[PDB]
Amino acid sequence: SLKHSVTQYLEEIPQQVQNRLYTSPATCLAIYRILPPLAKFFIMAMVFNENEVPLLDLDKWVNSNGKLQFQNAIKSMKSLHLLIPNKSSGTLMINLNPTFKISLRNALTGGEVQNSFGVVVEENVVSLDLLDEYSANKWETILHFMVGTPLAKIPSEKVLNLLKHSKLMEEVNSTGEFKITNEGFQFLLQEINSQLWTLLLQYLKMIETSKMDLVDVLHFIFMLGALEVGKAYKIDALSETQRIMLQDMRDYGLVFQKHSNDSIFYPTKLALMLTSDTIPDGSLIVETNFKIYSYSNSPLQIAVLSLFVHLKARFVNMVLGQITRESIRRALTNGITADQIIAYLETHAHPQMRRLAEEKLEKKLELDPNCKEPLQVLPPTVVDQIRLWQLELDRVITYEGSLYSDFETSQEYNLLSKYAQDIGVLLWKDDKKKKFFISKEGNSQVLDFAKR
Amino acid sequence: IVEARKKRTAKKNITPYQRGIIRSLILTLDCSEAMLEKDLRPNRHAMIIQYAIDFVHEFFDQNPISQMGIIIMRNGLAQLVSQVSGNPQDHIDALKSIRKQEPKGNPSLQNALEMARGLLLPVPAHCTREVLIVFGSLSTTDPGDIHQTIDSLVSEKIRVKVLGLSAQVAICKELCKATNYGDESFYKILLDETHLKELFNEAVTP
Amino acid sequence: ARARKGALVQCDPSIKALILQIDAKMSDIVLEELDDTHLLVNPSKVEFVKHELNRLLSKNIYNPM
Amino acid sequence: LPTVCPCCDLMLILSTHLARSYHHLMPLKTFAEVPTTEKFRSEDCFSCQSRFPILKNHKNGKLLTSSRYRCEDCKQEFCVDCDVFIHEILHNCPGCESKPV
Amino acid sequence: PADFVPDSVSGMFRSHDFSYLRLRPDHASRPLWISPSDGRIILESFSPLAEQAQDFLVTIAEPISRPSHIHEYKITAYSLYAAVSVGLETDDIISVLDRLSKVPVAESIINFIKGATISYGKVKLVIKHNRYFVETTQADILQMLLNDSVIGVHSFEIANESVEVVKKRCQEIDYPVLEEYDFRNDHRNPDLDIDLKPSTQIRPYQEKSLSKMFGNGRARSGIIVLPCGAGKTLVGITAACTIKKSVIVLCTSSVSVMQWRQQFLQWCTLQPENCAVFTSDNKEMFQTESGLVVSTYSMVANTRNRSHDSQKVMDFLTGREWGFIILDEVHVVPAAMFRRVVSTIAAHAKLGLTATLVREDDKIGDLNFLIGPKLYEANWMELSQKGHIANVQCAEVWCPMTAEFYQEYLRETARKRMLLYIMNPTKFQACQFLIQYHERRGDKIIVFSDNVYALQEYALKMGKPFIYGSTPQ
Amino acid sequence: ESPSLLTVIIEIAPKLWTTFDEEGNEKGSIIKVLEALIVFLNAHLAFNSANKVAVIAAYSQGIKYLYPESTSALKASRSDLKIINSDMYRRFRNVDETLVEEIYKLFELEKKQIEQNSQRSTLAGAMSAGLTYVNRISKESVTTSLKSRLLVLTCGSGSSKDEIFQYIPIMNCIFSATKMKCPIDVVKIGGSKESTFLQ
Ligand SMILES: [Zn+2]
Ligand SMILES: [Zn+2]
């Protein structure tokens, strides 16, 4: 989800780069906040004592009901290279990472932190009036660009290349429009904190050039998570690489700047929401006649609902729409699966639909208590119709490759078919018809097998 | 806040009245045909059993030294389903077992009172003898004179509190008045769901 | 042991019966029939087959105006 | 616990079992609603330091029916949350114990 | 609009962006959303004050759809005609809609209310001695009709066959015709002592439908639709007992005529000597000054050379001024000469009772011209949840066609294709399995198939009786 | 996983700590226990982003909420004293500066009111106030599923013996914490090995 993604990314970091990442206390604190509570407890009990701690002593800490979780915590400390094992006196002694321990101690007690948390310049503006509005403006700009609605203002080419080179948001130049993938509608589903995290890890994946240093980006991301909204910070502590990527998130919306290349920068609410989280708008009512009464006023929810709902009228409160066959066909031609649509309709379901489903299930349990049913918050007829439209899109599946036949001997056909099955590219075979089919990627292997 | 002040005015009667800490409570639960009435969600009998489970938990949480037994009135007979003991788990298991069975019959107040009188006989003098009757029906059939049983309960210093479900039964009011030295406030009738919760939570106090 | 340039497709017998009339109408649609559920459509027209298949099944779908 | 001893018919209790029923023996007097015109000792609560709000029920309400609940001994101020919390879960007034008697 | 700045998300709305309507501060209590584009009304049932608005909408508007949570109504001219007729003045409707809606009532909707509500009740069709007179309280309305002049206080006689043309033409003009029967003040037609038996109880939805029919104390001609088995026949009996005039009832089948005669003689205090049946076997009419006659659409509208007795009975029906006609299954009235049964019979009040008010052609929209405005819609979910009708579990079983059957399906003409997709063996297997399963549950099962050959083949294969047209009675 | 609330009930009494300083070799142990508590609170705030800290001091003449400040005092205030260095993390810095400022104010109050010697310990009332604050943070429910934990840093120093008046309030606090599932950890700094009520 959120912690798993940053945990897997920090696994891919090399050990020397990982130890170089432990210099700034803010990075160490932000990394430590990701760890499991048992791992955090062991680390925090292990920082303040300079002597090494045996692993058998740590095993005695955990009760028998959570021992497996202990192993998982150890596995995380066996993944992030925080605990160094040692073989001494026939014992698996455990030592703490010295740079991480020193930086965490400096973060806790205070002291030499080399301005990892920045310096406050005491000049500030209203966060809700300007800083929340700027971050929401940039986020709505990039989201309205990626959902495909027309915009008077489009974001700059730095994020257009980000969307082009990403797995989501495919682009075509033959038509001049941008096509949303399945991963795009997946990105529209979850809450904005892990959306920002997925964006930042994709940006981290792209950065390989000599203009940008990876450790500086990780330090800057973690201190932006450490910065507080409503108070600007000076740019002088940042490097020129950090300055240009500060401008990059000024365009992106994680940070606000009054003017370009200013001496100060204002953190936004997305900076604090990057670490952890904390009827509604977009709540919808589905009926049997496929009418969607979606209580939405923000253009983002209306735009993402327009991907699969034929909108009819717009009010201040809801958007009167209808789930038609053509709108669902439009959604499925973008690769948006029916399960994603059903999950979106479930997550945005009205409280009144929830009450009606609860009453129906209460009548069901007092009638048939022998079996239990899931709480179908939305009617099953529209779910079945969505899945039916998904099925009629995929009535045929087309595999392209090569079919081999015309074998005078059955033994040669059997040998080639079992070779194709062993290399895992065969899709169908028959000795009665003497034909076997292989995929496009598996053609050349059988070609070099037959030629040699 | 005027309604809140009326609620605050009812709490002004604070007195350090002497209360019997060591208690021997006998919970009498109706299991009659009137327990099959569906004015209480979902039926009367299941809700009384569940709220009796909650009452057992609260009573043994607030009165640990006090012992308790459970009697039901079913088919005109008093069935003792858990002996007078200080372990709440046995009473919880007994109430869970009674929850499965279907209530039936015409309840007998006199049989339940005689069974409780037999149960409260070995109770020591320092331990107060209390009976809680959750009476669901409006009429009772007894094998003998219930007034003699009431007089015997008065002579044995046994105090009976009756929570009724439908209306004010005269014999329950007379029994409460006789056992509680003329106090007519020990006969309580609910109004809705939460009033039954409040009446059950009121009986855990000594 | 010869190689051709074709695409194998999976379909129910109804869609299998549907695309043989496409072969009877337009010659370069299918090359040869394999089974009652596997066909071999020429890859240069498969999307075109798609472009008619939803058009061929559109007569079975009622669209309100 | 608490049970009779099966070998000598003796009650076996802990100190907490006796402690659970002391609050019936010395119940707390209910806290008094403060007057609106009376000068309040603290702007916030005493037990949980919650700020008492503007308390303007109508346009010129001012600090009408102020949520402070004055105790009868220590005269400390408690909000409605603290008042219902002492009436339900706690059984001792913090102000009466903070008083250096 | 109200100088609303257009958002970029309003691009695909075809001028349906109603965000210029400023949201009221007390909107959350108000359960309505008025759309200025077509007068469509969006009601939330789950909010408080919903039923106190639901009755208002079912009096002033026609419900497009009634799902569980959000209901969709249509403000139309005919709904407003019945709204003003039952005593709702123009300003009251605007005031209540203003009070009960979140978005403000747009000036286009208000102007539609004024335009449809005013100029109503001006032109009226009255019947005097089996002769149709169109009457107007204002003089110049007679002189402004110079196009469809079928002339043969201020009133002129029109022909009996031309009444439909007059109603259509006056509906095209802003003066719709008022068709109300003041049976209380009507003394030329002799009264009947017909009244409901005290043992007969009437359900509240039937009472609501009849209150829609008799709201102002005058019988209003119109259409009532109720589900089958919900008691539309009893509604007809009660309407006849309310009007207490001579009643003519038209049906589609002779068994329906027998059933209507049985229901009349059972629920209400009508003697059999006041009841007459005009069928092939029975042609004797009642000899009293007033009574009930029941017949079929086909015999009344028979253009063929009818018998002498039937001609005499038809002359009796035409020469008698009837106070009430009950057209059962009014969806067949828009047919060729079933249309003419309202012209051949001079009836003051016309009530059309139906269950299926749809036709595949547009002539089902001609019944407001023939009978009158659609008085009442029964909510079939509301009747099913109260146990008045059954709670059906509608389903559609997808039977795949086999390989050899589907090949022949594509190389065939449509008439043979119709027979060929019925007789696919998977449908045989599905029908057999469903019959076996629901017979094990102990259910009475009816298997419908319009193809006679398919019906016989399925019945012979499954060993069940079959009933079709050529089966003896 | 789930954030928690750490409510610290510290018993700072000038008579109690002076006895510990006289018994021990070192002096000014109040500074040592205060800085250890500050590092522990910074550690607890580092454990989760959404955890909260409550600090209540029980002095001789009563109790007072060290952290957070009084809302009247917060509205009145801000002289940022340099007791704690300003280059640290701001989330830690605000809590530490507020805590040391309220230590300053409470010790000024103790110095002003040093002439009156109180024979009534206010530790149990401070625990009751901490329980009320814990209920407020649970009852307020601004944050989903806040948990809770009391930590009582007391000192006996071999001078204050067992106090029989404390027995009923400590038992009531035990029952209240058991009702709200709030564990109570106790650190005792002194020569008295056994403290029966706190154990
Ligand atoms: Zn408080
Ligand atoms: Zn007090």
Helix and strand element counts for chain B (H, E): 7, 6
CA angle A415–A419–A424, rounded 5-degree value: 150
CA E209/CA D3 separation, integer angstroms? 72
The DSSP H or E segment spanning E244 is: none
What DSSP assignment string belongs to D22-72?
Answer: HHHHSPPPPPEEPPSSSPPS-SB-SSS-PBP----SSTT-SSTT-S-EE-S
Q: Which ligand is nearest to the CA of F129?
A: 1
Q: Which two tokens stand for residue A77?
A: 């400390």
Per the entry, the structure determination technique was cryo-EM
List the beta strands (DSSP E) in chain F.
4-10, 52-59, 62-67, 147-155, 184-189
Element housing E282 (H / E): none
Q: Do chains F and A touch (3 or more CB pairs under 8 A)?
A: yes
Residue E252 CA to chain centroid, in angstroms? Answer: 16
Pick the residue of A29, A40, A108, A234 with the most F CBs within 10 A to test the interface with F by mutation: A108
DSSP characters over A21-90: TTSSHHHHHHHHTTS-HHHHHHHHHHHS--S-EEHHHHHHHS-TTSHHHHHHHHHHHTTTT-EEEEEETT
From ligand 2's centre to the CA of B4, what distance in Å? 21
Whole-Å CA distances, A236 to A226, A263, E323: 18, 7, 98
Answer yes or no: are the C-beta atoms of F184 and F150 closer than 8 Å.
yes
Question: What distance lies between CA A260 and its chain's CA centroid?
Answer: 30
Residues 6+ apart with CB under 8 A from E158: E132, E133, E134, E150, E151, E152, E166
Nearest to D80 by CA among F7, F179, F125, F139: F139
The Cβ of residue E183 has, within 10 Å, a number of other Cβ atoms equal to 21
Residues in chain B within 8 Å Cβ distance of D67: none
**How close is the nearest chain C Cα to the Cα of A444, in Å?**
11
Assess E395–C contact: CB distance below 8 Å, yes or no. Answer: no
F186 DSSP β-pair partners:
F152
Question: How many Å apart are CA E78 and CA B24, to the nearest integer?
Answer: 76
* Residue E402 contacts C, CB cutoff 8 Å: yes
F89 → closest Cβ in A32, A117, A119: A117
Structure tokens given for E293: 């006659």
The dihedral through the CA atoms of F122, F128, F131, F133 has a sign that is negative
CB B42 within 8 A of CB B85: no
Amino acid at A48: F
DSSP element (H, E) containing B13 = none
Chains F and E touch (3+ CB pairs under 8 A): no
Shortest CA distance to E333 belongs to which of E302, E303, E366?
Answer: E366
Q: Which residue of F has its CA nearest to A108?
A: F42
Q: Whole-angstrom Cα distance, residue A227 to residue A26?
A: 10
E66 SS3 class: coil
CA–centroid distance, residue D67 to ligand 1 (Å): 9
In sequence order, what are the beta bridge partners of E42? E33, E72
Q: Are B164 and B135 in contact (CB under 8 A)?
A: yes
Q: Could you tell me if D90 lies within 8 Å of chain F, comparing CB atoms?
A: yes
Domain hosting residue F88, numbered range = 4-199
From the list A198, A208, A191, A394, the residue with the least C-alpha distance to A273 is A191
Taking the centre of ligand 2 as the mean of its atom positions, its distance from the CA of residue F135, in whole angstroms, is 18
**Candidate from F71, F116, F132 with C-beta closest to D47:** F132
Pairwise CB contact (< 8 Å): A111 & F91: no
Helices (H), F78-122: 90-112
Asked whether E241 and E399 are in contact (CB, 8 A), the reply is no
Query: In degrees rounded to 5, what are phi and psi of residue B166?
Result: -105, -55
Cβ <8 Å between A399 and C41: no
**Residue E261 to residue E272: CA distance in whole angstroms:** 9
What is the C-alpha end-to-end distance of chain A, expressed in Å?
48
Name the domain count of chain F. Answer: 1
Distance in angstroms (rounded) separating the CA atoms of residues E334 and E341: 10
Question: Residue F39, class by beta-carbon neighbours within 10 Å (0-12 exposed, 13-18 middle, 19+ buried)?
Answer: middle
Q: Say whether E231 counts as a known binding-site residue.
A: yes
Distance separating alpha carbons of residues D94 and F123, to the nearest angstrom: 10
* Chain D hits for F7, Cβ within 8 Å: none
Chains C and A touch (3+ CB pairs under 8 A): yes
Q: CA–CA separation, D19 vs F194, rounded Å?
A: 21
DSSP states along E314-337 = HHHHHHS-EEEEEEESGGGTTSTT
Contact of E127 with E348, CB cutoff 8 Å: yes
Q: Is E233 annotated as a binding residue?
A: yes
> Looking at the CA of D75, which ligand is closest?
2
Q: Which of E89, E91, E59 is nearest to E75 (CA)?
A: E59
* E275 appears as a binding residue in the annotation: no
Residue type for A17, please?
V
Q: At a CB cut-off of 8 Å and minimum separation 6, what does A337 contact?
A: A182, A390
All residues at 6 or more sequence positions from E340 whose CB lies less than 8 Å from its CB, including other chains: E161, E301
Partner-chain contact D30 B87, CB within 8 Å: no
At F96, list the tokens: 């530490």
Residue of E333, E378, E331 whose CA lies nearest to E235: E378
Q: Determine the Cα–Cα distance for residues A442 and A430; give it in Å rounded to an integer.
A: 18
Q: Which residues of F touch D (CB under 8 A)?
A: 58, 60-63, 65, 68, 70-72, 75, 116, 118-120, 122, 124-126, 128-129, 131-133, 135-136, 139, 167-169, 171-176, 179-180
Which residues on A lie below 8 Å from F48 (Cβ)? Answer: 33
Q: CB under 8 Å to A437, separation ≥6 — which residues? A: A399, A401, A402, A403, A404, A426, A427, A428, A429, C8, C38
Q: What is the DSSP letter of F165?
A: G
Specify the DSSP class assigned to residue A129.
I
Contact B160, B152 (CB under 8 A): no
Q: How many CA atoms lie within 13 A of A145 on its CB side?
A: 20
Which chain D residue lies closest to B86 (C-alpha atoms)? D3
Nearest CB to F62 within list D44, D85, D98: D98
Cβ burial of A123 (10 Å; 0-12, 13-18, 19+) is: exposed
> In angstroms, rounded to a whole number, what is the distance separating the alpha carbons of residues E137 and E155?
9
Whether the Cβ atoms of residue B94 and residue B72 lie closer than 8 Å to each other: no
Six token digits for residue A3:
């912690």
Q: Is C21 on the interface with E (CB under 8 A)?
A: yes
Residues of B in contact with D81 (CB under 8 A): none
Chain F residues within 8 A of A114 when measuring between CB atoms: none
Tell which residue, A213, A200, A221, A196, has the closest CA to residue A29.
A221
Q: Of C14, C49, C41, which Cα lies nearest the Cα of E410?
A: C14
Alpha carbons within 13 A on the beta-carbon side of D14: 8
Distance from CA of A298 to the nearest CA of E (A): 9
Phi, psi of B67 (to 5 degrees): -100, 165
B206 near D CB under 8 A: yes
Please tell me if residue B21 touches chain D, with a CB cutoff of 8 Å: yes
Neighbours of chain F (3+ CB pairs under 8 A): A, D
Q: How far apart are CA A45 and CA A42, in angstroms?
A: 5
Question: What Rg value do the Cα atoms of chain D yield, rounded?
Answer: 20
Among F58, F62, F71, F102, which Cα is nearest to F84's?
F102
Tell me the nearest-neighbour CA distance from D19 into chain F, angstroms.
Answer: 6
Q: Do C36 and E402 count as a contact with CB atoms less than 8 A apart?
A: no
Radius of gyration of chain F (CA): 17
Counting the structural domains of chain C, the total is 1
Q: What is the DSSP code (8-state) at residue A120?
A: B
**Measured distance CA(A240)–CA(A248) in Å, rounded:** 12
* Continuous segment of H or E residues that includes residue B75: none
Show the tokens assigned to C5: 């340039």
Residue D97 Cα to ligand 1 middle (Å): 16
Determine contact: A427 vs chain C, CB below 8 A: yes
DSSP A168-211: SSEE-TTTS-EE--HHHHHHTTS-HHHHHHHHHHHHHHH--STT
**Residue of chain F whose Cα is closest to the Cα of A223:** F89
Within a 10 A sphere around the Cβ of E257, how many other Cβ atoms? 22
Taking the CA of D96 as reference, the closest ligand is: 2
Q: List the one residue out of E369, E340, E367, E366 whose CA is nearest residue E354.
A: E367
**CA–CA distances in Å: residue E103 to residues E24, E111, E222, F198:** 7, 17, 33, 64
The C-alpha of A66 sits at a distance from chain F's nearest C-alpha, in angstroms, of 15
- Least Cα distance to F143 among F71, F66, F48 occurs for F48
C-alpha span between E331 and E370 (Å, rounded): 11
Residues 6 or more apart from C5 whose CB is under 8 A from it?
Answer: A402, C42, C43
Please tell me whether residue D77 adopts helix, strand or coil conformation.
Answer: coil
Distance CA E473, CA E339 (A): 30
Our CA dihedral for A219, A225, A229, A233, rounded to 10 degrees, sits at -10
Which residues have C-beta within 8 Å of that of residue F54, sequence separation ≥ 6? F5, F6, F7, F8, F65, F67, F68, F130, F133, F134, F137
Map residue E113 onto helix, strand or coil.
helix
Can you give the CATH number for the domain in which F107 is found? 3.40.50.410
CA distance A139 to D44: 40
DSSP assignment string, E413-465: -HHHHHHHHHT-HHHHHHHHHHHHHHHHTT-------S-HHHHHHHHHHHT--
Residues of B in Cβ contact (< 8 Å) with D29: 14
* Interface size, chain A vs chain E, as Cβ–Cβ contacts under 8 Å: 76
Cβ neighbours of F84 in A, within 8 Å: 110
Alpha helices in E106-231 (DSSP H): 107-117, 140-144, 163-172, 204-213
Name E322's bridge partners.
Answer: E347
Note down the domain range covering C33: 1-65
Q: Do A313 and E18 form a contact (C-beta atoms < 8 A)?
A: yes
| Chains contacting D (3+ CB pairs below 8 angstroms) | B, F
Distance A419 CA to ligand 2 centre (A): 88
Q: At what angle do helices A67-77 and A37-47 cross, to 10 degrees?
A: 60
Sign of CA dihedral A101, A107, A109, A113: positive
Q: Are β-strands A319-322 and A310-314 bridged in parallel, bridged antiparallel, or unpaired?
A: antiparallel
